[PDB]
Amino acid sequence: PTGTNMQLKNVAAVMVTASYPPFARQGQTIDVVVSSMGNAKSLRGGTLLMTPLKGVDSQVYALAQGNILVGG
């Protein structure tokens, strides 16, 4: 319901950046960088949910999902 107080602690909003390689083909996998956006403390053992990676033309060129590796 729209009127409800949700105070989460295990969820962080993140921005995902990636590089589209030359001659990229569908089904191929690429590395991504995940960066927190606001007042989050750590992303040490987090998991990235389904994220569509848009280009400059605002079209989906890849889908991102996996486990983050943070140095610590």
Partner: protein, 58 residues
């Protein structure tokens, strides 16, 4: 199959047949007014109640 559907993006109409809620809130008000006026009053008088003799002919 309804095709690809974004997970975190806000639900927006994208194709023909999709629905959208319009909140009709119109409040338009225009007004104009003007006026003009002009007035002119003029009074003039001259009277010789008692005329001396040397001025009588005039």
């Amino acid at each position: 199959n309804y095709g690809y559907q974004p997970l975190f993006e806000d639900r927006r109409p994208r194709n023909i047949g999709d629905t959208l809620t319009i909140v009709l809130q119109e409040n338009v008000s225009a007004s104009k007014s003007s006026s003009a006026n002009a007035s002119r009053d003029g009074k003039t008088s001259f009277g010789f109640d008692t005329v001396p003799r040397y001025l009588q002919g005039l």
